């Protein structure tokens, strides 16, 4: 990872524009749930 | 069978229409969605010893911005397209004064013919397409993401924003199926937008070189 | 693998193989599966009926008596039809030794040097455990016919292929044989 | 983005545990009416979303890159920090928010 | 389907055309002997290759100590109660675990399947 | 692993012998030799191998 | 209603088709013009094909062979009686429908057998033991992963396919 | 169906071998093909490669000098009937015939009409052969083949028909696509291969539809078939997916295969590492294997390339061409 | 034969299903038989070392032994050992403990 937050090799060729497509390291992340994917439309409207 | 080959011609015409729409040319909506029965009514029902003889399937299309771009498509009669057939097609290209064309070969053309396509390349753009390749649209596959062709000003703005040279971009070959579908050439940059598992959306730029 | 009862002739092995019918060609498709033999100190393979005729058995009925022990079994003869057709153009015994003698370690300058060299290969280096001297070539024909007969039984599926990891098929070289 | 309806997604900040921590720190009583305004919730979520920066710059390409990089986390944040769930489920106060 | 040899030099006879009498003949390739063909068929192969394995069972297997033997099925000719049984006992034998029965009686050897 | 092995407790390795008395006994008890054989008799007779060498046939 | 023609092949096919209808004396039994019926069949075949080529010839010969055979007599009876119209009889789709009842029965039975011939893939393990806690259905499969290691022991993870519920063996 | 998994599958994906051990297509179906097992069987027969040996019961060369001789006791009736009407054939004919019998179990299974087979064996070769055939009423289902009617107008004949008979059993395609040996059928019990649709009420619903699993890869022809789903049909062969669809598609496919071979064991790895590996493999527009032939053909320095695999040959080439080293 | 298998395949599948169901049932009975003071159960429940299949193999049934993912092959002529009789496909002959 270079200082433009791009991921480059020794030839300075761009492999990824951001690391992991989001620019986040792998230590601070956790499994979560969206809670907006797969309720029915009526239930989603009532809940939100 | 004859019905199978009629279906083959209809499906390959639909793929040509989708390709011409995706390349930026002007096609009608009903031309985009033709049914098998409508195609049979328009062109004939039995192509063997019958009306649709692979000659009347040539299509006139023009670009949206410029009405004089005037790209054609051609369906050669013989399965093995040669220098004689390509010379006839290029001479015809010369009197109707157009610059770009597609050739839909049945199975394959001769190496001398495909070299003559390279020799004729600067003045006239000739692209080889097999009938097996065009039997389905590869851009509708779930593996293939969306490809957008970038303009020169957009490429210049991109390289100025990221402070990059053209060498440092990822590459895509000119013989790539998507590259040949879009008719892209060397030096142009294609823009790929794909869904991301971690960030939702990710945009990748690839140089055709 | 054949040895002269652990007294001399350290390594002497023979391969009798049946080539596959998957070969793509006009000649390959018509014949079927031929049977070939690989002999020691010979550069390339030899057809199996050439070796039998080189031992002095000229008529193919005498060849098939040593290979097939019951002529009333019909399925056995179709596996040896292309072997006879491949070796059809050689009929005389000394021609067969000339055929084998052309494929030695070095080709002989004279023809009779090749025939003499092919004869001593079939005496000394061809199955030494059966015999080495004089009229043991008659005993060599039965064992060579037995090897072909065992090859046909595995090809017909009437016997199971031998597995190499069976340790009854192994011998232990102790200090005696080692020294 | 997600066919087959799979909701288990790896994301940096654990918003449910952060809400629980806020409830325990600020002694939130879930059986009393709150003093948190939904407009304050919406404006705070918007101003927080403007502060999670991955790609800098005011170029349109930079703005598109920022939106694409922070899309999934912003969707999760707006879903779990919405005004109805703040009023009815978590019942936070202004200081806790 | 069978192979017949020459009666002069004991070589293999080959089938060939008799173009005037319009009859199949077998002739030796190494001499001039010719023999009229009675079967009038030359080449045949059974692709499914279904064969009765009872012809491939030697009657001597009744003396094997390792084969199992049963008492429920008697022999058909001599009516002996004891008889050994075994499976197909060969490779490329398609898919069947069918038992083959051999009577273990002296001066017998009748073979039957069930 | 699996390439270096040890003998069992009561396992014994044969030391070797000469097949001449066995050949003499076999010849004295029938065992028609391959020189005196007719090829029609091999079908219904048991083949006899001594140290891997086919020496004759037998009928009992 | 048979349009006559001067083609030798056409009239010869008509007369073999008539002689095919002569088999079994069912034309005597019914009382129908077998020559006119065969001419009608041949005319309908010529309308279908518009040629005297291979498809014309082998279609005619297939109809002749399906007429003269003795194991399917009621087909000839229904053709001569008028139960099967001639224009339909010209276009019967080979033996899938122009057949006797026993051949159709064994074709259906072997069509049911080639179900069991070519499913394969050995997909389901067929547990059918654990009852679900959400949809209460026992059609489930189990998973054996995470062998040995420091902490995690082998715990069977069972999934119900119909409702998607997953519950640990515990 | 057996699938290679673990270290050998990982080695295949990393090396990008041109011949995997078990290359397969999952094939999805459209319309009523996905619901009716009869129509799915029709698609099965359309895709599976069928050689004439698979439908032939047994084959025999007879010698009938006369078409009215008929040394076979049963064929005399219809063989006259095709000689009652001599069609497209000179009555002068060679006396050597080849008659085959076709098994009924393998006939209705693959849904071939014998009229179609006689068309395929003739039009595939041309006017060089003659075939006379039956209807299926007889319990012995017979097709008899003769040589040139016009030859009599080397190689002999018996050798020639044996050369013909051994070629029909090997490489004559009657149905299906070659390099596809055997294709299966199953209703998927896992939501990964089931069809996921969003209902009108808005909840995710899984539908059981028939899918096909093959052995061998022809992705171009399978996708070009009218009956499959073009959107969702995919293989596990990296090179054919590349050459058919493109570099982005093969990057996504490589990511999917790596995730499958990792998560089959129940283990989990973060997405960033798989994404980085796939991006490094597909960065330069072609499949760059993690081998000497993939790594040492890059634009990296000679000192980078000498520490991996071939050490001295790299320095030979660099000294011969005078290649500088930027030392990054 | 079961859908999509030969006679050998369906026979081996049926016998392996019977043996695996027997091993699972015996293991479930053995695990139900354990008291609350059982040290094996303490070790397994804590997750420090051991597993339920280890408990089952200690107490009730070791189970079927497999070589190359398959039941014990006939290394001799159509028998696994000289102590067994020829063409014996029973559980004792083919390696079920
Ligand atoms: Zn002769
Ligand atoms: Zn008896
Ligand atoms: Zn699940
Ligand atoms: Zn004949």
Curated annotation (Swiss-Prot), chain E:
The keyword Transmembrane does not apply. Zn(2+) 2 binds at residues 75, 78, 103, 108. A zinc finger (TFIIS-type) spans 71-113. Gene3D superfamilies: 2.20.25.10. Keywords: Acetylation, DNA-directed RNA polymerase, Metal-binding, Nucleus, Transcription, Zinc, Zinc-finger. Its main location: nucleus. It is found in: Nucleus, Nucleolus. It holds the Pfam family Zn_ribbon_RPB9. A zinc finger (C4-type) spans 6-31. Zn(2+) 1 binds at residues 6, 9, 28, 31. GO terms for molecular function: DNA-directed RNA polymerase activity; nucleic acid binding; zinc ion binding. CDD domains: Zn-ribbon_RPB9 (cd10508). SMART domains: RPOL9 (SM00661), ZnF_C2C2 (SM00440). The keyword Nucleus applies. One of its GO terms (biological process) is maintenance of transcriptional fidelity during transcription elongation by RNA polymerase II. GO terms for cellular component: nucleolus; nucleus; RNA polymerase II, core complex. Belongs to the archaeal RpoM/eukaryotic RPA12/RPB9/RPC11 RNA polymerase family. DNA-dependent RNA polymerase catalyzes the transcription of DNA into RNA using the four ribonucleoside triphosphates as substrates. Component of RNA polymerase II which synthesizes mRNA precursors and many functional non-coding RNAs. Pol II is the central component of the basal RNA polymerase II transcription machinery. It is composed of mobile elements that move relative to each other. RPB9 is part of the upper jaw surrounding the central large cleft and thought to grab the incoming DNA template. Component of the RNA polymerase II (Pol II) complex consisting of 12 subunits. PANTHER family: DNA-DIRECTED RNA POLYMERASE, DNA-DIRECTED RNA POLYMERASE II SUBUNIT RPB9. This is DNA-directed RNA polymerase II subunit RPB9. It comes from Sus scrofa.
UniProtKB/Swiss-Prot annotation, chain G:
A zinc finger (TFIIS-type) spans 128-168. Keywords: Acetylation, Chromosomal rearrangement, DNA-binding, Isopeptide bond, Metal-binding, Nucleus, Phosphoprotein, Transcription, Transcription regulation, Ubl conjugation, Zinc, Zinc-finger. Residues 9-125 form the TFIIS central domain. One of its GO terms (cellular component) is nucleoplasm. GO terms for molecular function: DNA binding; zinc ion binding. Zn(2+) binds at residues 132, 135, 160, 163. It is found in: Nucleus. One of its GO terms (biological process) is transcription elongation by RNA polymerase II. Necessary for efficient RNA polymerase II transcription elongation past template-encoded arresting sites. The arresting sites in DNA have the property of trapping a certain fraction of elongating RNA polymerases that pass through, resulting in locked ternary complexes. Cleavage of the nascent transcript by S-II allows the resumption of elongation from the new 3'-terminus. Interacts with EAF2. Associates with UBR5 and forms a transcription regulatory complex made of CDK9, Pol II, UBR5 and TCEA1/TFIIS. Part of TBP-based Pol II pre-initiation complex (PIC), in which Pol II core assembles with general transcription factors and other specific initiation factors including GTF2E1, GTF2E2, GTF2F1, GTF2F2, TCEA1, ERCC2, ERCC3, GTF2H2, GTF2H3, GTF2H4, GTF2H5, GTF2A1, GTF2A2, GTF2B and TBP; this large multi-subunit PIC complex mediates DNA unwinding and targets Pol II core to the transcription start site where the first phosphodiester bond forms. S-II binds to RNA-polymerase II in the absence of transcription. Belongs to the TFS-II family. It is linked to A chromosomal aberration involving TCEA1 may be a cause of salivary gland pleiomorphic adenomas (PA) [181030]. Pleiomorphic adenomas are the most common benign epithelial tumors of the salivary gland. Translocation t(3;8)(p21;q12) with PLAG1. This is Transcription elongation factor A protein 1.
């Amino acid at each position: 990872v270079k200082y433009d937050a791009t991921v480059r090799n020794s030839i300075n060729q761009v492999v990824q524009l951001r690391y992991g497509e989001d620019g986040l390291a792998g230590e601070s992340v956790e499994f979560q749930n969206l809670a907006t994917l797969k309720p029915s439309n009526k239930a989603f409207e009532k809940k939100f | 069978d004859d019905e199978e080959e009629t279906y083959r011609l209809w499906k390959i015409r639909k793929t040509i229409m989708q390709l011409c729409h995706d390349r930026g040319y002007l096609v009608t909506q009903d031309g985009l969605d033709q049914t098998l029965e409508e195609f049979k009514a328009q062109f004939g029902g039995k192509p063997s010893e019958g009306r649709p003889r692979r000659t009347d399937l040539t299509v006139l299309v023009a670009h949206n911005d410029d009405p004089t771009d005037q790209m054609f498509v051609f369906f050669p009669e013989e399965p093995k397209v040669g220098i004689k057939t390509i010379k006839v097609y290029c001479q015809r290209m010369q009197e109707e004064n157009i610059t770009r064309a597609l050739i839909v070969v049945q199975q394959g053309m001769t190496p001398s013919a495909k070299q003559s396509l390279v020799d004729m390349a600067p003045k006239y753009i000739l692209e080889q397409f097999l009938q097996q390749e065009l039997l389905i649209n590869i851009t509708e596959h779930e593996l293939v993401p969306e490809h957008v062709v970038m303009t020169k000003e957009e490429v210049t703005e991109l390289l100025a924003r990221y402070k990059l040279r053209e060498n440092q971009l990822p590459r895509i070959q000119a013989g790539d199926p998507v590259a040949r579908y879009f008719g892209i050439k060397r030096g142009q940059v294609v823009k790929i937008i794909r869904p991301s598992e971690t960030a939702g959306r990710y945009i990748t730029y690839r140089l055709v070189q | 693998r054949s040895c002269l009862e652990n007294s001399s002739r350290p390594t002497s092995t023979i391969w009798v193989s049946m080539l596959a019918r998957g070969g793509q060609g006009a000649k390959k498709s018509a014949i079927g599966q031929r049977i070939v033999a690989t002999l020691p100190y010979i550069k390339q393979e030899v057809p199996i009926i050439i070796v039998f005729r080189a031992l002095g058995f000229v008529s193919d009925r005498d060849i098939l008596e040593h290979i097939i022990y019951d002529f009333e079994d019909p399925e056995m003869m179709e596996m040896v039809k292309p072997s006879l057709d491949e070796a059809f153009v050689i009929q005389e015994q000394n021609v067969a030794l000339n055929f084998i003698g052309s494929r030695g370690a070095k080709p002989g300058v004279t023809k009779e040097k090749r025939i003499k060299y092919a004869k001593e290969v079939l005496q000394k280096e061809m199955l030494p455990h059966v015999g080495v001297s004089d009229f043991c070539e008659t005993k060599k024909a039965y064992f060579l016919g037995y090897m072909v007969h065992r090859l046909l039984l595995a090809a017909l599926g009437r016997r199971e292929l031998d597995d190499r990891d069976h340790y009854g098929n192994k011998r232990l070289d102790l200090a005696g044989p080692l020294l | 983005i997600f066919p087959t309806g799979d909701s288990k997604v790896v994301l940096p900040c654990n918003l449910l545990r952060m809400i629980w921590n806020a409830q325990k720190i600020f002694h939130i009583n879930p059986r009393l009416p709150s003093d948190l305004h939904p407009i304050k919730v919406v404006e705070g979520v918007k101003e927080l979303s403007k502060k999670l920066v991955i790609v800098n710059g005011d170029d349109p390409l930079s703005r598109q890159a920022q939106e694409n990089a922070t899309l999934l986390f912003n969707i999760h944040l707006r879903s779990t920090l919405c005004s109805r769930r703040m009023a009815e489920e978590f019942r936070l106060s202004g200081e806790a928010f | 389907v069978g192979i017949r040899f020459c009666q002069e030099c004991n070589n293999m006879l080959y089938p060939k055309e008799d173009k005037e009498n319009r009859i199949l003949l077998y002739a030796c390739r190494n001499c001039d002997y010719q023999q009229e063909a009675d079967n009038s068929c030359i080449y045949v192969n059974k692709i499914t290759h279904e064969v009765d394995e009872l012809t491939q069972i030697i009657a001597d297997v009744s003396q094997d100590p390792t084969l199992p033997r049963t008492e429920d099925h008697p022999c058909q000719k001599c009516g002996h109660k004891e008889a050994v049984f075994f499976q197909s006992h060969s490779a490329r034998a398609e898919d069947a675990m069918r038992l083959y029965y051999v009577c273990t009686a002296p001066h017998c050897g009748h073979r039957w399947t069930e | 692993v699996g390439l270096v092995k040890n003998l069992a407790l009561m396992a014994y390795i044969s030391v070797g012998s000469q097949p001449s008395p066995i050949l003499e006994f076999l010849e004295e008890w029938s065992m028609e030799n391959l020189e005196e054989i007719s090829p029609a008799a091999i079908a219904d007779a048991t083949k006899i191998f001594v140290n891997g060498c086919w020496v004759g046939i037998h009928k009992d | 209603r048979a349009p006559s023609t001067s083609d030798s092949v056409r009239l010869k096919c008509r007369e073999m088709l008539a002689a095919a209808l002569r088999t079994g004396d069912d034309y005597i039994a019914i009382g129908a013009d077998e020559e006119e019926l065969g001419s009608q069949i041949e005319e309908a075949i010529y309308q279908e094909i518009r040629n005297t080529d291979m498809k014309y010839k082998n279609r005619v010969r297939s109809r002749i062979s399906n007429l003269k055979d003795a194991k399917n007599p009621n087909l000839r009876k229904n053709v001569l009686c008028g139960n099967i119209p001639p224009d339909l009889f010209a276009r019967m789709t080979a033996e899938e429908m122009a057949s006797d009842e026993l051949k159709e029965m064994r074709k259906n039975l072997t069509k049911e057998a080639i179900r069991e011939h070519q499913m394969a893939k050995t997909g389901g393990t067929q547990t059918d033991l654990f009852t679900c806690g959400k949809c209460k259905k026992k059609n489930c499969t189990y998973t054996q992963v995470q062998t040995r290691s420091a902490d995690e022991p082998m715990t069977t993870f069972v999934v119900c396919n119909e409702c998607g519920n997953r519950w640990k063996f515990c | 169906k057996n699938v290679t998994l673990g270290v050998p599958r990982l080695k295949e994906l990393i090396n990008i071998s041109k011949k995997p051990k078990t290359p397969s297509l999952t094939v999805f179906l459209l319309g009523q093909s996905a619901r009716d097992a009869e129509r799915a069987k029709d698609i099965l027969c359309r895709l599976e490669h069928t050689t004439l040996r698979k439908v032939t019961a047994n084959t025999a060369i007879y010698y009938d000098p006369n078409p009215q001789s008929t040394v076979v006791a049963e064929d005399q009736e219809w063989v006259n009937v095709y000689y009652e009407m001599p069609d497209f054939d000179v009555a002068r004919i060679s006396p050597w015939l080849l008659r085959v019998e076709l098994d009924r179990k393998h006939m209705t299974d693959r849904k071939l009409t014998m009229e179609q087979i006689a068309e395929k064996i003739n039009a595939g070769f041309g006017d060089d052969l003659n075939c006379i055939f039956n209807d299926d009423n007889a319990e012995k289902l017979v097709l008899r083949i003769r040589i040139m009617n016009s030859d009599e107008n080397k190689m002999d004949d018996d050798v020639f028909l044996r050369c013909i008979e051994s070629n029909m059993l090997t490489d004559m395609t009657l149905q299906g696509i070659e390099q596809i040996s055997k294709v299966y059928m199953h209703l998927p019990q896992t939501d990964n291969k089931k069809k996921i649709i969003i209902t009108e009420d808005g909840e995710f619903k899984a539908l059981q539809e028939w899918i096909l699993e093959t052995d061998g890869v022809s992705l171009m022809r399978v996708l070009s078939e009218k009956d499959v789903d073009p959107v969702r049909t995919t293989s596990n062969d990296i090179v054919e997916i590349f050459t058919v669809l493109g570099i982005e598609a093969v990057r996504k496919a490589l990511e999917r295969e790596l995730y499958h071979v990792i998560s089959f064991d129940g283990s989990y790895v973060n997405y960033r590492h798989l994404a980085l590996l796939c991006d490094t493999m597909t960065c330069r527009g072609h499949l760059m294997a993690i081998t000497r032939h993939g790594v040492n053909r890059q634009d990296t320095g000679p000192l980078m390339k000498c520490s991996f695999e071939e050490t001295v040959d790299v320095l030979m080439e660099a000294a011969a061409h005078g290649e500088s080293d930027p030392m990054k | 034969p079961t859908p999509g298998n030969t006679l050998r395949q369906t026979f081996e599948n049926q016998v392996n299903r019977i043996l695996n169901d027997a091993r699972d049932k015996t293991g479930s009975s053995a695990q139900k038989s354990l008291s609350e003071y059982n040290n094996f159960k303490s070790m397994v429940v804590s997750g420090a070392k051991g597993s339920k299949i280890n408990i089952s193999q200690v107490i009730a049934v070791v189970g079927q032994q497999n070589v190359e993912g398959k039941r014990i092959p006939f290394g001799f002529k159509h028998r696994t050992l000289p102590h067994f009789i020829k063409d014996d496909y029973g559980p004792e002959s083919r390696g079920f403990v």
